[PDB]
């Protein structure tokens, strides 16, 4: 169908501008920011200024009540842009003023409109403050009762992965490729009418377990490309504690060429029910694309972290 | 006469699309799917969308009540396509949303219309979930009180047969030739007016014992082609436990050229009377086809597994 | 936006004389002096004479009540010039007549007009008098209850830094670059739309803690330019006791080219939360300027010295 | 501004005729004498005769009451010539008839007109008598209750300084240069608008401590030119007992070229506050003149000798 990504705040808009000018199929991007200076120079072709009568183009400050109230009084503006959609993604970095407050408001618009919403957040760095981590912890409660799926990319685990003195654009961009793989992973799943076919309906029942989520795409090629793709797709090194045990909903998609083997299918599916052996449901897909070469792809969604 | 195969669900349509573009004699195929994306690219010349007002062309999800209710409200649509027929086969992969629910509904249409129906199901893989096997076990009860003859091709026994790293298409396509052999075995029995002519009269009284069924066709050629055909046709490697002891209905068809020996018939009949020695009826047949070579064919139907 | 520096007294006018004829972007300068003899020859093209009916172009003497009452009666002139501004800096040298009295009055105009004001004072030399330091100590109370942020450049610590027999102009001119760095550092922070973006909103919430402040910009270039910039920006050698422990508000801006690294980022920020680990808020910024070379800049503002 | 020096008596006329025909900037001189014989031949272009109806142009004799009465009855003429001025200096040699009487009357005119007045006196020689020294002390007591600042050049200390058999004219011209240096130091204090700037206000509030005063200018050039100039400025060899301890008001002006060093200022101020460490106010100035050479000038005013 058609899908949308609403990235609120300046950091959420930073995820959007990378996605613009790529080859995009059936996806439109909306930028939300209380502060209008960040929306001045962006590659995204549409911009939304929220709280223009309450800030006149400025941010939310260190008090997120300014960012919460600015989005609250422009709830008329959020509903109009969210039309004709059935999957929205909330891109933000929690811990600040706007993204801590405005992102639940877009979720509140999303939940009021009967749409399936998934929020992607980044918990801040530890050195930037521990007192400000407290309301960032309470900001999770602000998002735990309004969003079906909590995607978290904590910044305290940013240095432990590729700690070779990478660029600040690169480690920020690594979290962006998590969300881009999340957006493109759902998009390639539903749009493609494979030999076996998963669409929106069994997508919807997976992350309705109301818990923490994790969704990324592992790509492998080789003789044992099935185990390398299954283990890469389940590995999310950019989280504090993934806590795969006690999950309540699993969604697996398999993509391979016409040389796809039952040994390849089982060994991807062999590692998925080891932690999902509890009283929980697992949805499995399969796709057979003839034009693309021997590269294999596995997309895994795991929601319901209890 | 004229026969029909109604394959519900996306996987059931995959069984149907295998049978298209072959040489077809007096057989029509109808494709049933709640999800309309799988019906977009199929070789079958006619498509039926069920639940179009309840899903807008989407699936049934992990809850099979959506698949059951979508088929229930289009019972007006199921009766119209099932007309002028006297043998329908229900092709589905059980354990999901639609095939768990919609296949009993097509059976309920079939039973209400006074037609002889046999349902072919595939119990899911063990790694895909054991909790979802529980309602798949209750899904057997959903089909045990609406279908005369239960055909099961469990996916847990897919590995033990030709486990040489076969393709996912090949392991799935093996079960489709089981149903194609089931359809073509009945059709070649009925359409041919051989030297001995089995027809509708003895066919109906065999599988009306209201139990599990098994329908395969063994082909052998050689000096002892009788025992190789009889033992292949009685062996169904794609089932959990065939349980041939305690059967209540046996239907046997023998096909050979004019060089047929009376010892060829007896030894095929000898291995069938061994396990059918209980208080049960056995129907046998004979065919004398002059044009075809020394290749011999044996079709055995065993319904009433108790 | 547009910002203003209000420099009262003759010495405060000397601070204004330094910044006139430089390349100025969005900043206007207003000169205040009760004594009109120092305003006779100034490089600034605009002047304000306060107390012309009470002194006729003369100073305030050793009694600052003359300097206080001269500004108090001409409060009509101070409000008219302070229009369309959102950030004013009070440049004065305390301990005299006018700057001891008139600078709180401009603050009183600033506080009445709903503007964010920071007052910058220089405590006098120790040899010029200790009795006159007593009301200069009491002049701190005169400014502690009217200005959000107290910037102090004491003259008793002037000799301990670059005590190589520097010029009187150079020892005085060092304190003017404290102001020029303070004014330009806030100016370059907001006027630039960086890749990450700070503006007035989180600026405003930092120094509203009603305490002593410190504002300097450390510039480093090299292999370990992160630690050299962070330690230079946190070091203010021109104060009595900086007292970083017990701060209530921190504002940090980071400027680098597109080769910016994580190992640059935390190592700047690691020295900031060592003393700001108490129950206080910390704001971090970041800018990515492509045109400029490998030189790196760090601007730190720390208000709320308790 | 514009300043005046009122010189009563023959010694005052000698001081005035010494200052006339020099290069004069903004200064006017008025010559007062009860005896017109000294006013017969003077280089000053304007003359005032007081007591012309009481003496017919003769002196006051050995009784100062005659000069006091003459000045009292020509107070009407005294008031008219003192107009438009803000600084007057009383030049007289005490111990005689006219100056001992007329100078307190000019002081009374100055105090009645709201002007800043400082009196310069010369206590007479010891060999001329001690009975007249008694009423010289009485005249000092008379002038102590009418003049803000008492400048004394006693003649008993005239021989102790440069005692190489100098002429009487040479010692008289030395005292005249003391008074001229006082007047001219005040002149280029108020007239010059230096980089730092002293004006009339702190001047007015310094010598209002109502005590003995001292006003001299020390000039030095060299490597340690600060200490030599400051010690020459503080040394007044032409007084009985300078009594720097217990002062109540200090006024210092510093003049140097653009090569002025901080250490010069430190050493000058350091040798000022040693005797000015009591509960007293110190006013410190600075000037930066670019055209003149490496010569340095220090002007020190110390009023309030207690
Ligand atoms: N990992 C990243 N986190 C970010 C980035 N940008 C912001 N953030 C996080 O977002 C938080 C601050 O965002 P704000 O709530 O202030 C949204 P704001 O309106 O201030 O954006 P702008 O004013 O447009 O810069 C803070 O905790 C940061 O850790 C980024 O590029 N990467
Ligand atoms: N052996 C096979 N089993 C299958 C195949 N396709 C599906 N299935 C089984 O069917 C079950 C899921 O089918 P569904 O009830 O969801 C019918 P659905 O409307 O979802 O089909 P589509 O949405 O058109 O793909 C699941 O338990 C699978 O094990 C197949 O090609 N081979
Ligand atoms: N560090 C510096 N302190 C100064 C400077 N100029 C003045 N001051 C300080 O300011 C105080 C005196 O300022 P005033 O109250 O007299 C203001 P005023 O009207 O007299 O200035 P002008 O009359 O124009 O010179 C005194 O304590 C000095 O220590 C300067 O150039 N540098
Ligand atoms: N140091 C100096 N003291 C003087 C000078 N002339 C006078 N005097 C002192 O002034 C005192 C006498 O001055 P008078 O009061 O008589 C003023 P008078 O009108 O009589 O001056 P003439 O009429 O010009 O003689 C006496 O004590 C002298 O010591 C002088 O040139 N230098
Ligand atoms: K799909
Ligand atoms: K037949
Ligand atoms: K900015
Ligand atoms: K001056």
């Amino acid at each position: 169908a058609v899908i949308k990504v609403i990235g609120v705040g300046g950091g959420g808009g930073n995820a959007v501008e990378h996605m613009v000018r790529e080859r995009i199929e059936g996806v439109e991007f909306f930028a939300v920011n209380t502060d209008a200076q960040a929306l001045r120079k962006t590659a995204v072709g549409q911009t939304i200024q929220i709280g223009s009568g309450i800030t006149k183009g400025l941010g939310a400050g260190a008090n997120p009540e300014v960012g919460r109230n600015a989005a609250d009084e422009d709830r008329e503006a959020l509903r109009a842009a969210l039309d004709g959609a059935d999957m929205v993604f909330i891109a933000a970095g929690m811990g600040g003023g706007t993204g801590t407050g405005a992102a639940p408001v877009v979720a509140e618009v999303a939940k009021d409109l009967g749409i399936l919403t998934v929020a992607v957040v980044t918990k801040p760095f530890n050195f930037e403050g521990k007192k400000r981590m407290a309301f960032a912890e309470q900001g999770i409660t602000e998002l735990s009762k309004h969003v079906d799926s909590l995607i978290t990319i904590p910044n305290d685990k940013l240095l432990k992965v590729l700690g070779r003195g990478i660029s600040l654009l690169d480690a920020f961009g690594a979290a962006n490729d998590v969300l881009k793989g999340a957006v493109q992973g759902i998009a390639e799943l539903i749009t493609r009418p494979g030999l076996m076919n998963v669409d929106f309906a069994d997508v919807r029942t997976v992350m309705s377990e109301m818990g923490y989520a994790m969704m990324g795409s592992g790509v492998a090629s080789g003789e044992d490309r099935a185990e390398e793709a299954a283990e890469m797709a389940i590995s999310s090194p950019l989280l504090e504690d993934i806590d795969l045990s006690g999950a309540r909903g699993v969604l697996v998609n398999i993509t391979a060429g016409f040389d796809l083997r039952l040994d390849e299918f089982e060994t991807v599916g062999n590692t998925i029910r080891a932690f999902a052996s509890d009283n929980a449901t697992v949805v499995i897909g399969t796709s057979l694309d003839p034009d693309m070469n021997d590269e294999l792809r596995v997309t895994v969604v795991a929601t319901g972290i209890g």
Side-chain angles (χ1 to χ4, degrees), chain A:
Chain A
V2 60
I3 52 174
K4 186 182 287 185
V5 179
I6 301 184
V8 310
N14 287 133
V16 176
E17 43 184 350
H18 181 38
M19 293 180 183
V20 177
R21 94 189 176 271
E22 304 160 347
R23 300 182 179 181
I24 301 299
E25 288 270 315
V27 187
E28 75 264 22
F29 315 104
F30 279 91
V32 159
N33 217 359
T34 55
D35 189 358
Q37 195 71 263
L39 296 165
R40 294 301 173 82
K41 186 215 84 172
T42 45
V44 55
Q46 52 179 13
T47 45
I48 294 178
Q49 302 195 16
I50 290 173
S52 184
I54 210 173
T55 49
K56 211 197 61 188
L58 303 186
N63 218 23
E65 276 95 4
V66 190
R68 175 160 76 154
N69 294 350
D72 198 1
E73 60 91 20
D74 274 23
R75 189 172 297 174
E76 317 280 337
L78 276 171
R79 179 213 185 78
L82 195 152
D83 47 344
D86 43 4
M87 181 85 48
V88 297
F89 284 117
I90 301 167
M94 291 265 298
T98 291
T100 312
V105 177
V106 188
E108 190 178 329
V109 172
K111 194 179 178 60
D112 263 348
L113 286 172
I115 203 173
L116 186 61
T117 177
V118 176
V120 183
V121 301
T122 79
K123 280 177 68 170
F125 296 90
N126 187 82
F127 51 85
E128 310 211 335
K130 62 101 174 179
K131 173 180 167 47
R132 75 186 296 272
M133 212 66 167
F135 81 89
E137 202 174 38
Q138 312 291 40
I140 307 301
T141 305
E142 195 180 353
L143 213 62
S144 69
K145 261 75 182 173
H146 268 272
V147 176
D148 313 327
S149 313
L150 191 45
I151 295 285
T152 308
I153 315 181
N155 301 152
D156 184 74
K157 290 268 177 290
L158 266 179
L159 279 76
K160 322 293 177 301
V161 173
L162 205 46
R164 55 167 177 91
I166 43 169
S167 182
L168 194 46
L169 271 186
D170 270 346
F172 285 169
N176 189 359
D177 265 12
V178 175
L179 192 155
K180 178 161 80 179
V183 172
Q184 217 160 358
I186 286 289
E188 66 183 1
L189 187 152
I190 301 174
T191 304
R192 264 299 178 254
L195 272 296
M196 184 177 177
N197 205 0
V198 176
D199 298 333
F200 263 119
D202 62 348
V203 168
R204 172 90 203 198
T205 182
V206 166
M207 72 295 278
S208 57
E209 306 287 333
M210 301 325 178
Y212 317 107
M214 171 295 278
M215 61 156 308
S217 67
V219 168
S221 180
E223 271 305 359
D224 203 13
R225 56 178 178 148
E227 277 284 341
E228 307 152 7
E231 286 302 318
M232 187 66 204
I234 193 66
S235 75
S236 287
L238 303 102
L239 282 73
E240 293 286 326
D241 287 315
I242 183 55
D243 294 341
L244 294 174
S245 52
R248 301 298 100 158
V250 192
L251 195 150
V252 189
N253 183 276
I254 310 300
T255 304
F258 280 168
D259 62 358
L260 162 64
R261 176 168 68 256
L262 182 60
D263 194 17
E264 303 273 319
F265 185 82
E266 59 182 357
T267 54
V268 177
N270 279 135
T271 186
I272 194 57
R273 75 291 181 281
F275 67 96
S277 173
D278 215 3
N279 315 316
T281 66
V282 176
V283 174
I284 303 94
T286 304
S287 173
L288 277 297
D289 205 17
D291 51 351
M292 51 76 88
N293 267 292
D294 306 357
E295 164 165 326
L296 190 149
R297 198 168 258 166
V298 167
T299 298
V300 167
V301 182
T303 318
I305 302 305

PDB file of all heavy atoms in Angstrom, chain A residues 133-146:
ATOM      1  N   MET A 133      18.323  11.756  32.567  1.00  0.00           N
ATOM      2  CA  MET A 133      17.932  10.395  32.222  1.00  0.00           C
ATOM      3  C   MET A 133      16.704   9.957  33.009  1.00  0.00           C
ATOM      4  O   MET A 133      16.016   9.011  32.606  1.00  0.00           O
ATOM      5  CB  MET A 133      19.094   9.436  32.484  1.00  0.00           C
ATOM      6  CG  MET A 133      19.158   8.249  31.542  1.00  0.00           C
ATOM      7  SD  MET A 133      19.500   8.769  29.852  1.00  0.00           S
ATOM      8  CE  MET A 133      19.891   7.202  29.078  1.00  0.00           C
ATOM      9  N   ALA A 134      16.421  10.621  34.136  1.00  0.00           N
ATOM     10  CA  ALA A 134      15.292  10.233  34.977  1.00  0.00           C
ATOM     11  C   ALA A 134      13.963  10.528  34.296  1.00  0.00           C
ATOM     12  O   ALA A 134      13.082   9.665  34.240  1.00  0.00           O
ATOM     13  CB  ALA A 134      15.370  10.940  36.332  1.00  0.00           C
ATOM     14  N   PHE A 135      13.798  11.742  33.762  1.00  0.00           N
ATOM     15  CA  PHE A 135      12.580  12.026  33.010  1.00  0.00           C
ATOM     16  C   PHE A 135      12.592  11.323  31.659  1.00  0.00           C
ATOM     17  O   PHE A 135      11.526  11.058  31.092  1.00  0.00           O
ATOM     18  CB  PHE A 135      12.367  13.546  32.870  1.00  0.00           C
ATOM     19  CG  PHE A 135      13.170  14.214  31.766  1.00  0.00           C
ATOM     20  CD1 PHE A 135      12.677  14.314  30.467  1.00  0.00           C
ATOM     21  CD2 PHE A 135      14.389  14.804  32.047  1.00  0.00           C
ATOM     22  CE1 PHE A 135      13.411  14.933  29.473  1.00  0.00           C
ATOM     23  CE2 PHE A 135      15.113  15.440  31.055  1.00  0.00           C
ATOM     24  CZ  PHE A 135      14.624  15.502  29.772  1.00  0.00           C
ATOM     25  N   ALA A 136      13.782  11.033  31.124  1.00  0.00           N
ATOM     26  CA  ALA A 136      13.879  10.180  29.944  1.00  0.00           C
ATOM     27  C   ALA A 136      13.412   8.764  30.259  1.00  0.00           C
ATOM     28  O   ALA A 136      12.870   8.072  29.391  1.00  0.00           O
ATOM     29  CB  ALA A 136      15.312  10.173  29.414  1.00  0.00           C
ATOM     30  N   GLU A 137      13.641   8.310  31.494  1.00  0.00           N
ATOM     31  CA  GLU A 137      13.029   7.069  31.955  1.00  0.00           C
ATOM     32  C   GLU A 137      11.522   7.228  32.130  1.00  0.00           C
ATOM     33  O   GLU A 137      10.752   6.331  31.769  1.00  0.00           O
ATOM     34  CB  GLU A 137      13.680   6.622  33.263  1.00  0.00           C
ATOM     35  CG  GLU A 137      13.522   5.149  33.565  1.00  0.00           C
ATOM     36  CD  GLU A 137      14.305   4.729  34.789  1.00  0.00           C
ATOM     37  OE1 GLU A 137      14.353   5.512  35.760  1.00  0.00           O
ATOM     38  OE2 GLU A 137      14.873   3.617  34.781  1.00  0.00           O
ATOM     39  N   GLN A 138      11.080   8.362  32.685  1.00  0.00           N
ATOM     40  CA  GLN A 138       9.646   8.622  32.774  1.00  0.00           C
ATOM     41  C   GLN A 138       9.050   8.956  31.415  1.00  0.00           C
ATOM     42  O   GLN A 138       7.835   8.840  31.226  1.00  0.00           O
ATOM     43  CB  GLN A 138       9.352   9.752  33.768  1.00  0.00           C
ATOM     44  CG  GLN A 138      10.029   9.681  35.149  1.00  0.00           C
ATOM     45  CD  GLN A 138       9.544   8.556  36.070  1.00  0.00           C
ATOM     46  OE1 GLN A 138       9.299   7.424  35.653  1.00  0.00           O
ATOM     47  NE2 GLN A 138       9.408   8.884  37.349  1.00  0.00           N
ATOM     48  N   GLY A 139       9.879   9.377  30.461  1.00  0.00           N
ATOM     49  CA  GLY A 139       9.387   9.569  29.110  1.00  0.00           C
ATOM     50  C   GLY A 139       9.029   8.267  28.424  1.00  0.00           C
ATOM     51  O   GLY A 139       8.267   8.260  27.454  1.00  0.00           O
ATOM     52  N   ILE A 140       9.590   7.151  28.898  1.00  0.00           N
ATOM     53  CA  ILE A 140       9.188   5.840  28.395  1.00  0.00           C
ATOM     54  C   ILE A 140       7.752   5.539  28.804  1.00  0.00           C
ATOM     55  O   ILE A 140       6.963   5.014  28.009  1.00  0.00           O
ATOM     56  CB  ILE A 140      10.163   4.756  28.889  1.00  0.00           C
ATOM     57  CG1 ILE A 140      11.605   5.141  28.548  1.00  0.00           C
ATOM     58  CG2 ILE A 140       9.826   3.409  28.277  1.00  0.00           C
ATOM     59  CD1 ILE A 140      11.862   5.330  27.071  1.00  0.00           C
ATOM     60  N   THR A 141       7.388   5.877  30.046  1.00  0.00           N
ATOM     61  CA  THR A 141       6.004   5.738  30.493  1.00  0.00           C
ATOM     62  C   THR A 141       5.079   6.658  29.702  1.00  0.00           C
ATOM     63  O   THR A 141       3.922   6.314  29.435  1.00  0.00           O
ATOM     64  CB  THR A 141       5.914   6.026  31.996  1.00  0.00           C
ATOM     65  OG1 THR A 141       6.832   5.179  32.698  1.00  0.00           O
ATOM     66  CG2 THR A 141       4.512   5.770  32.530  1.00  0.00           C
ATOM     67  N   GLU A 142       5.588   7.824  29.291  1.00  0.00           N
ATOM     68  CA  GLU A 142       4.853   8.706  28.390  1.00  0.00           C
ATOM     69  C   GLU A 142       4.597   8.061  27.034  1.00  0.00           C
ATOM     70  O   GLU A 142       3.625   8.420  26.361  1.00  0.00           O
ATOM     71  CB  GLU A 142       5.629  10.016  28.218  1.00  0.00           C
ATOM     72  CG  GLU A 142       4.851  11.164  27.598  1.00  0.00           C
ATOM     73  CD  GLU A 142       5.691  12.422  27.464  1.00  0.00           C
ATOM     74  OE1 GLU A 142       6.831  12.433  27.973  1.00  0.00           O
ATOM     75  OE2 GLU A 142       5.215  13.396  26.845  1.00  0.00           O
ATOM     76  N   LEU A 143       5.439   7.111  26.622  1.00  0.00           N
ATOM     77  CA  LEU A 143       5.277   6.422  25.350  1.00  0.00           C
ATOM     78  C   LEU A 143       4.820   4.976  25.494  1.00  0.00           C
ATOM     79  O   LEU A 143       4.432   4.365  24.493  1.00  0.00           O
ATOM     80  CB  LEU A 143       6.593   6.457  24.561  1.00  0.00           C
ATOM     81  CG  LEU A 143       6.521   6.530  23.036  1.00  0.00           C
ATOM     82  CD1 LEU A 143       5.845   7.800  22.576  1.00  0.00           C
ATOM     83  CD2 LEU A 143       7.912   6.449  22.462  1.00  0.00           C
ATOM     84  N   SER A 144       4.856   4.411  26.705  1.00  0.00           N
ATOM     85  CA  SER A 144       4.446   3.022  26.884  1.00  0.00           C
ATOM     86  C   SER A 144       2.933   2.849  26.841  1.00  0.00           C
ATOM     87  O   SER A 144       2.458   1.731  26.616  1.00  0.00           O
ATOM     88  CB  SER A 144       4.983   2.472  28.206  1.00  0.00           C
ATOM     89  OG  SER A 144       4.341   3.083  29.310  1.00  0.00           O
ATOM     90  N   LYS A 145       2.168   3.921  27.050  1.00  0.00           N
ATOM     91  CA  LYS A 145       0.714   3.841  27.086  1.00  0.00           C
ATOM     92  C   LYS A 145       0.070   4.496  25.870  1.00  0.00           C
ATOM     93  O   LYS A 145      -1.133   4.771  25.884  1.00  0.00           O
ATOM     94  CB  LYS A 145       0.181   4.469  28.375  1.00  0.00           C
ATOM     95  CG  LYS A 145      -0.148   3.452  29.450  1.00  0.00           C
ATOM     96  CD  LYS A 145       1.112   2.918  30.103  1.00  0.00           C
ATOM     97  CE  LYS A 145       0.788   1.871  31.151  1.00  0.00           C
ATOM     98  NZ  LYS A 145       2.017   1.221  31.682  1.00  0.00           N
ATOM     99  N   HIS A 146       0.847   4.762  24.818  1.00  0.00           N
ATOM    100  CA  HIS A 146       0.291   5.350  23.606  1.00  0.00           C
ATOM    101  C   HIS A 146       0.798   4.732  22.312  1.00  0.00           C
ATOM    102  O   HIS A 146       0.210   5.009  21.263  1.00  0.00           O
ATOM    103  CB  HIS A 146       0.564   6.861  23.574  1.00  0.00           C
ATOM    104  CG  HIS A 146      -0.536   7.684  24.171  1.00  0.00           C
ATOM    105  ND1 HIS A 146      -1.614   8.131  23.438  1.00  0.00           N
ATOM    106  CD2 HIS A 146      -0.729   8.131  25.435  1.00  0.00           C
ATOM    107  CE1 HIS A 146      -2.420   8.823  24.222  1.00  0.00           C
ATOM    108  NE2 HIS A 146      -1.906   8.838  25.439  1.00  0.00           N
TER     109      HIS A 146
END
